[PDB]
C-alpha cells in the first residue's frame, strides 16, 4: 500500500471488535468485580 504502514485495520474488524467489547469484556468485568467484592480477607 501507499504508506498504509501505519496499519489500516480491515473492513471487517467491527464485526469482531464490537461484540468483543460489548459482550465479552463486560462479562469479564462483571465476573472479576463480583469475585473482588465477595472476597473474605
Amino acid at each position: 500500500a501507499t504508506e498504509g504502514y501505519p496499519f489500516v485495520p480491515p473492513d471487517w474488524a467491527p464485526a469482531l471488535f464490537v461484540p468483543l467489547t460489548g459482550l465479552v469484556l463486560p462479562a469479564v468485568g462483571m465476573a472479576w468485580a463480583f469475585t473482588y467484592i465477595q472476597k473474605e480477607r
Partner: protein, 145 residues
C-alpha cells in the same frame, strides 16, 4: 470482613450493600483513607495525574485513529463546504435494514456517524491533509500515552 475497600478497613467491615457504593464513591478520597501520610498522598496524586494524562492522550489517539479509518477526511479536504465530517462507523447488530440505509451519510458505504466535534476543521487548519498523517498522529499519541 471483606477486602474490596482496602483503603478503608471500616468500610470493609460493613456487611451491607452500602460497602460497595461507599468504596466506589470514596475511591480517590485519599485524605480519608486509613493509615495514609501526606507524602504518600502527594505521590498517589502525582501518579493519578499521570494516569489522567495517559487517558487523555489515549482518547485523542483513538479520535485520530477512528477519523483516519472510517472518516471522510480526504473528501472533506477536497470539499469542506459540502462534504460532512464522519466520526466513526456504526456497527450495531440490532439495527434494521432501513437503519443501515439511513446512516450512510457523507458519501460513505456503511452506517457512519456525522462528526460535530470540530476536529476536521481544526486538522485542516493545522496542515493535516491525508489520513496517513492522522494515522501517524494516532500512533504517536498512543506512544506518548
Amino acid at each position: 470482613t471483606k477486602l474490596f475497600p482496602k483503603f478503608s478497613q471500616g468500610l470493609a467491615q460493613d456487611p451491607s450493600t452500602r460497602r460497595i457504593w461507599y468504596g466506589l464513591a470514596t475511591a480517590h478520597d485519599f485524605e480519608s483513607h486509613d493509615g495514609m501520610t501526606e507524602e504518600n498522598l502527594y505521590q498517589k496524586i502525582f501518579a493519578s495525574h499521570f494516569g489522567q494524562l495517559a487517558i487523555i492522550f489515549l482518547w485523542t489517539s483513538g479520535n485520530l485513529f477512528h477519523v483516519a479509518w472510517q472518516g471522510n477526511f480526504e473528501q472533506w479536504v477536497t470539499d469542506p463546504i459540502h462534504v460532512r465530517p464522519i466520526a466513526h462507523a456504526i456497527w450495531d447488530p440490532h439495527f434494521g435494514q432501513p437503519a443501515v440505509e439511513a446512516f450512510t451519510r457523507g458519501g460513505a458505504s456503511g452506517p457512519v456517524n456525522i462528526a460535530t466535534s470540530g476536529v476536521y476543521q481544526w486538522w485542516y487548519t493545522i496542515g493535516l491533509r491525508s489520513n496517513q498523517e492522522l494515522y501517524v498522529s494516532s500512533v504517536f499519541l498512543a506512544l506518548v500515552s
